[PDB]
Amino acid sequence: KIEFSKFTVKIKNKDNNSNWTDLGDLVVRKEENGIDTGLNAGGHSATFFSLKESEVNNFIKAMTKGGSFKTSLYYGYKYEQSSANGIQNKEIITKIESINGAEHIAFLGDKINGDKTAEYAIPLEVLKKNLK
């Protein structure tokens, strides 16, 4: 059983030099079945990744303690390759990471266009406050 309906939390990515930069806000929404999350970065607004009921516990766990979950669809952001059409069952895999003094949930995205993927970071304390 899950209390929450909808909330927002800041998301960062690693820029062209591998520096954590603020990207935007991520709108996590709770469905009849699963979670949708969507990226409002710059003036682009579009679904980021989603997952059904069964991966929910794996989500919460993952997004609070570090772990992994299976998405229904992962698109990401524009630079990564899966944003045109999205990819089913992409496994997201999370770590805890202190960035300034603030622990974040960090995970890799998709391949961009020597294989380079996108990297992402959301603060842990906000994910814990809201994810229940």
mmCIF file of C-alpha atoms in Angstrom:
data_model
loop_
_atom_site.group_PDB
_atom_site.id
_atom_site.type_symbol
_atom_site.label_atom_id
_atom_site.label_comp_id
_atom_site.label_asym_id
_atom_site.label_seq_id
_atom_site.Cartn_x
_atom_site.Cartn_y
_atom_site.Cartn_z
ATOM 1 C CA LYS A 1 0.000 0.000 0.000
ATOM 2 C CA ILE A 2 1.284 3.385 -1.133
ATOM 3 C CA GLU A 3 0.226 6.768 0.309
ATOM 4 C CA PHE A 4 1.465 9.272 -2.226
ATOM 5 C CA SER A 5 -0.088 10.635 -5.399
ATOM 6 C CA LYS A 6 2.348 13.063 -6.968
ATOM 7 C CA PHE A 7 5.475 14.983 -6.171
ATOM 8 C CA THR A 8 8.524 16.656 -7.688
ATOM 9 C CA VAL A 9 12.234 16.428 -6.971
ATOM 10 C CA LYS A 10 15.331 18.041 -8.522
ATOM 11 C CA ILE A 11 17.313 15.969 -11.034
ATOM 12 C CA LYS A 12 20.902 16.457 -12.182
ATOM 13 C CA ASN A 13 23.064 15.048 -14.967
ATOM 14 C CA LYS A 14 26.727 14.767 -15.775
ATOM 15 C CA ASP A 15 27.615 17.289 -18.420
ATOM 16 C CA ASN A 16 30.052 17.082 -21.343
ATOM 17 C CA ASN A 17 33.029 17.113 -18.911
ATOM 18 C CA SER A 18 31.528 14.592 -16.430
ATOM 19 C CA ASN A 19 30.392 17.323 -14.057
ATOM 20 C CA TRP A 20 27.125 17.068 -12.140
ATOM 21 C CA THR A 21 24.958 19.947 -13.329
ATOM 22 C CA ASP A 22 21.315 20.650 -12.492
ATOM 23 C CA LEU A 23 19.086 19.449 -15.389
ATOM 24 C CA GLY A 24 15.567 20.199 -14.048
ATOM 25 C CA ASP A 25 12.655 18.798 -11.987
ATOM 26 C CA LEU A 26 11.184 15.284 -12.195
ATOM 27 C CA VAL A 27 7.449 14.768 -11.667
ATOM 28 C CA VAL A 28 6.807 11.391 -10.067
ATOM 29 C CA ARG A 29 3.179 10.292 -10.371
ATOM 30 C CA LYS A 30 1.455 7.230 -8.900
ATOM 31 C CA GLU A 31 -0.975 5.260 -11.169
ATOM 32 C CA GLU A 32 -3.717 2.655 -10.690
ATOM 33 C CA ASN A 33 -0.905 0.431 -11.978
ATOM 34 C CA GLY A 34 2.742 1.491 -11.568
ATOM 35 C CA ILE A 35 4.490 4.865 -11.506
ATOM 36 C CA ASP A 36 4.990 7.406 -14.270
ATOM 37 C CA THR A 37 7.836 9.881 -13.992
ATOM 38 C CA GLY A 38 8.356 12.777 -16.425
ATOM 39 C CA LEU A 39 11.122 15.255 -17.166
ATOM 40 C CA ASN A 40 10.539 18.995 -17.325
ATOM 41 C CA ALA A 41 14.028 20.060 -18.382
ATOM 42 C CA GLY A 42 14.477 23.417 -20.104
ATOM 43 C CA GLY A 43 11.273 23.948 -22.078
ATOM 44 C CA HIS A 44 10.930 20.237 -22.993
ATOM 45 C CA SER A 45 8.209 18.325 -21.065
ATOM 46 C CA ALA A 46 7.978 14.558 -21.678
ATOM 47 C CA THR A 47 7.885 11.104 -19.984
ATOM 48 C CA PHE A 48 11.216 9.981 -18.536
ATOM 49 C CA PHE A 49 10.606 6.369 -17.413
ATOM 50 C CA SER A 50 7.682 4.289 -16.122
ATOM 51 C CA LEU A 51 7.118 0.906 -14.422
ATOM 52 C CA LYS A 52 4.106 -1.216 -13.352
ATOM 53 C CA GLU A 53 2.879 -2.277 -9.821
ATOM 54 C CA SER A 54 5.199 -5.316 -9.533
ATOM 55 C CA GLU A 55 8.425 -3.166 -9.777
ATOM 56 C CA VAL A 56 7.079 -0.628 -7.215
ATOM 57 C CA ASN A 57 8.720 -2.130 -4.108
ATOM 58 C CA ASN A 58 11.908 -2.519 -6.157
ATOM 59 C CA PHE A 59 11.501 1.128 -7.071
ATOM 60 C CA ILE A 60 11.038 2.474 -3.541
ATOM 61 C CA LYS A 61 13.822 0.296 -2.141
ATOM 62 C CA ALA A 62 16.075 1.269 -5.065
ATOM 63 C CA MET A 63 15.323 4.974 -4.864
ATOM 64 C CA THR A 64 15.905 5.044 -1.041
ATOM 65 C CA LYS A 65 18.593 2.400 -0.334
ATOM 66 C CA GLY A 66 20.260 1.860 -3.733
ATOM 67 C CA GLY A 67 19.304 -1.149 -5.832
ATOM 68 C CA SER A 68 17.517 -1.808 -9.118
ATOM 69 C CA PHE A 69 14.069 -1.942 -10.827
ATOM 70 C CA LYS A 70 12.549 -2.875 -14.228
ATOM 71 C CA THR A 71 10.894 0.006 -16.173
ATOM 72 C CA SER A 72 7.901 -0.531 -18.501
ATOM 73 C CA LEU A 73 9.403 2.084 -20.806
ATOM 74 C CA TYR A 74 12.586 4.224 -20.532
ATOM 75 C CA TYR A 75 13.061 7.192 -22.901
ATOM 76 C CA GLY A 76 15.338 9.467 -20.815
ATOM 77 C CA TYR A 77 16.353 12.857 -22.234
ATOM 78 C CA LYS A 78 17.085 14.029 -25.765
ATOM 79 C CA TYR A 79 20.778 13.142 -26.100
ATOM 80 C CA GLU A 80 20.231 9.545 -25.260
ATOM 81 C CA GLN A 81 19.225 7.250 -27.897
ATOM 82 C CA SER A 82 16.077 5.694 -26.393
ATOM 83 C CA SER A 83 14.202 9.053 -26.267
ATOM 84 C CA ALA A 84 12.687 8.808 -29.753
ATOM 85 C CA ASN A 85 11.088 5.411 -29.134
ATOM 86 C CA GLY A 86 11.816 4.315 -25.526
ATOM 87 C CA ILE A 87 12.959 0.810 -24.453
ATOM 88 C CA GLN A 88 11.036 -1.885 -22.588
ATOM 89 C CA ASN A 89 12.273 -3.497 -19.394
ATOM 90 C CA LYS A 90 15.376 -1.304 -19.174
ATOM 91 C CA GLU A 91 16.807 -2.085 -15.774
ATOM 92 C CA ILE A 92 17.695 1.016 -13.731
ATOM 93 C CA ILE A 93 20.443 0.458 -11.190
ATOM 94 C CA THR A 94 21.031 2.983 -8.429
ATOM 95 C CA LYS A 95 23.826 4.044 -6.044
ATOM 96 C CA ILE A 96 24.034 6.459 -3.070
ATOM 97 C CA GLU A 97 26.357 9.345 -3.846
ATOM 98 C CA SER A 98 27.349 12.374 -1.811
ATOM 99 C CA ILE A 99 27.803 15.190 -4.380
ATOM 100 C CA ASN A 100 28.471 18.412 -2.398
ATOM 101 C CA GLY A 101 27.488 17.363 1.113
ATOM 102 C CA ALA A 102 24.156 15.901 -0.063
ATOM 103 C CA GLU A 103 23.651 12.175 -0.702
ATOM 104 C CA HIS A 104 21.886 11.514 -4.027
ATOM 105 C CA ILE A 105 20.453 8.512 -5.783
ATOM 106 C CA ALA A 106 22.614 8.113 -8.902
ATOM 107 C CA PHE A 107 21.993 5.829 -11.929
ATOM 108 C CA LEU A 108 23.119 5.432 -15.586
ATOM 109 C CA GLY A 109 20.803 6.245 -18.507
ATOM 110 C CA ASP A 110 21.135 5.140 -22.135
ATOM 111 C CA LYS A 111 23.781 5.530 -24.839
ATOM 112 C CA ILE A 112 24.180 8.949 -26.350
ATOM 113 C CA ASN A 113 24.581 10.320 -29.783
ATOM 114 C CA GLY A 114 33.886 4.418 -27.218
ATOM 115 C CA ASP A 115 30.615 3.687 -25.449
ATOM 116 C CA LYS A 116 29.264 6.533 -23.264
ATOM 117 C CA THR A 117 25.912 6.435 -21.412
ATOM 118 C CA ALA A 118 24.009 9.256 -19.597
ATOM 119 C CA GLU A 119 24.437 9.650 -15.793
ATOM 120 C CA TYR A 120 21.804 10.914 -13.311
ATOM 121 C CA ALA A 121 21.420 12.038 -9.673
ATOM 122 C CA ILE A 122 18.413 12.869 -7.468
ATOM 123 C CA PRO A 123 18.823 13.940 -3.800
ATOM 124 C CA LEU A 124 18.171 11.102 -1.367
ATOM 125 C CA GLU A 125 16.465 13.095 1.451
ATOM 126 C CA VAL A 126 13.723 14.357 -0.839
ATOM 127 C CA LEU A 127 13.166 10.819 -2.310
ATOM 128 C CA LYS A 128 12.837 9.428 1.224
ATOM 129 C CA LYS A 129 10.433 12.139 2.532
ATOM 130 C CA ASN A 130 8.016 11.570 -0.356
ATOM 131 C CA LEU A 131 8.414 7.896 -1.470
ATOM 132 C CA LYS A 132 5.954 5.999 0.757
#
